[PDB]
Design a protein around this ligand. Structure first.
Ligand SMILES: *CC(=O)N[C@@H](CO)c1cccc(Cl)c1
Ligand SMILES: *CC(=O)N[C@@H](CO)c1cccc(Cl)c1
Lengths: 304, 304
């Protein structure tokens, strides 16, 4: 027993990290097969970031301007192309450490692990959620650009995120591995509004189930609610509306604990209206929404 | 910016995980050079755990009874010895993936990453602290025995913990890599008291500094305190007494922020006496003590 904010083992991703330098800018790249992927702003100087014309800036670069180093060894760049906000540098050597992988575009509310890197070197790994407003609340310093987010299913790494920037509010924005931003963001040094965020209701419910499984049950009550009634409360507290699709994915947790989804909704409704009254759930004094129902099942069943 | 409960990249440790089976019991082992380390209770059946005589149980085992598999390949066991609560199985092949490593016995209040494993396969990684009472609050299911805790300094992995058991209270106990338990615990299926735990004061202060660095400053006040006065408050709230050694290790954070350690103590004193008043600090509604001053400096400076 016990329930932690667990990240995937990062080894398979560590083997893909490289450093990419272009001019005086250095950031991280992801070396999979014979291609290195990195944020296209590696071609910018500080003055370029105000309003970069990436097509013109990239035209001034040749293959030999992209310096790619995998730890201590240098990669030879034989091609370069821009796809959306990512640069793809074709190298003459396939990464011998390339794991089985896929590129996926995750949905808001889904979770993933981030391998924070600097200068091509891994510093740490943490789990986070893609907020409903397509930002992430990560831990990224200058030079963390190019660090990636991923999930792992047995031997396959599904890369879902590449870090690009920090908004003036301190939250983070990035792209899928095809270089498409999550959210309305553009790779430019301009103030940009992130939408109104909400709490991921299905994840809070999943975490309440994890709490019951692991022994924290004080919040269980004698009440029930309906999807309609619960959604009036969810609206008032800036929670995502719960749908039958969310109830369906909570089914395994409802079956394991014997607590009907709408009964757990009534516990969550009471917690929203009354707070925790100085108590904690799974070591938290707030309602946690960074665990999906799948994360709860995986951790509670020991999936490797 | 941003501050997360970050674990070390687990790759170097993943390469050392093996499965160890003896009779009908299977758990994890750590393969470093030509030795595999694992909890000695791998030699017990369920009936043995009530009061095991490990010396007698181990006498019934020979090298060929210890089945060690590193992923898909089998290791040949050429020796076995018990050291405290760990078994050391000498194998005929040195682990080609052995990183530079050390065995360290950590102090209470220090932090480390755990690579949760099942059947020799890594499932996840998380950061935690060794509680002042020598327990850890981890996420461990049956078969997680043998999973290890570690810290990494550039290329060196310092292994500090090997998982052995879950107390009836749901907290976890284990040993250093020489098989000495942290705390008063014995490897037996008997109810065992963990001491009164306390909150790691120096870590809470370090985390308050991380909050100021990352923009959360609402808790800063116009007050100061003394070590003596603060320690009266620490005693009342079951916090560890603060010493000048703790003030000394907070020095870099005090210098960076310009907030004297005793001034931060007065903020912590006010938070203990008044609570958070429905506010949060670094996404938490309670006072976090799983970040050491070194963790805060490392994360705030991007150490790889
Ligand atoms: C990773 C990062 O923050 N990069 C910096 C440039 O170093 C940046 C600023 C503004 C926008 C973008 Cl896309 C990146
Ligand atoms: C890892 C674990 O919990 N092991 C179990 C036996 O499978 C155990 C029970 C009681 C004491 C000890 Cl040391 C281990």
């Amino acid at each position: 027993s016990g329930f932690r904010k667990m990240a995937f083992p990062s080894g398979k991703v560590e083997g893909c990290m490289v450093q990419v330098t272009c001019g005086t800018t250095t950031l991280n790249g992801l070396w999979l097969d014979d291609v290195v992927y990195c944020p296209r702003h590696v071609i910018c100087t500080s003055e370029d970031m105000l309003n970069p014309n990436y097509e013109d800036l990239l035209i001034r670069k040749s293959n030999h301007n992209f310096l790619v180093q995998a730890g201590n060894v240098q990669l030879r760049v034989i091609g370069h192309s821009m796809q959306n906000c990512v640069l793809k540098l074709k190298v003459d050597t396939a990464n011998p450490k390339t794991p089985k992988y896929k590129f996926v575009r995750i949905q808001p509310g889904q979770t993933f692990s981030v391998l924070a890197c600097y200068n091509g070197s891994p510093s740490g790994v943490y789990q986070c959620a893609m907020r409903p407003n397509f930002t992430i609340k990560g831990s990224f310093l200058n030079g963390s650009c190019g660090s990636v987010g991923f999930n792992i299913d047995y031997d396959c790494v599904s890369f879902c995120y590449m870090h690009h920037m920090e908004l003036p509010t301190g939250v983070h924005a990035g792209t899928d591995l095809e270089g498409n931003f999550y959210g309305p963001f553009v790779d430019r040094q301009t103030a940009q509004a992130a939408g109104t965020d909400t709490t991921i209701t299905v994840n809070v419910l999943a975490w309440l189930y994890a709490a019951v499984i692991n022994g924290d049950r004080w919040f269980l009550n004698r009440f029930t609610t309906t999807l309609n009634d619960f959604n009036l409360v969810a609206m008032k507290y800036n929670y995502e509306p719960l749908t039958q699709d969310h109830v369906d994915i909570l089914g395994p947790l409802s079956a394991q604990t014997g607590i009907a989804v709408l009964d757990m909704c009534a516990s969550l409704k009471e917690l929203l209206q009354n707070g925790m009254n100085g108590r904690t759930i799974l070591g938290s004094a707030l309602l946690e929404d960074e665990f999906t129902p799948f994360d709860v099942v995986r951790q509670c069943s020991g999936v490797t």
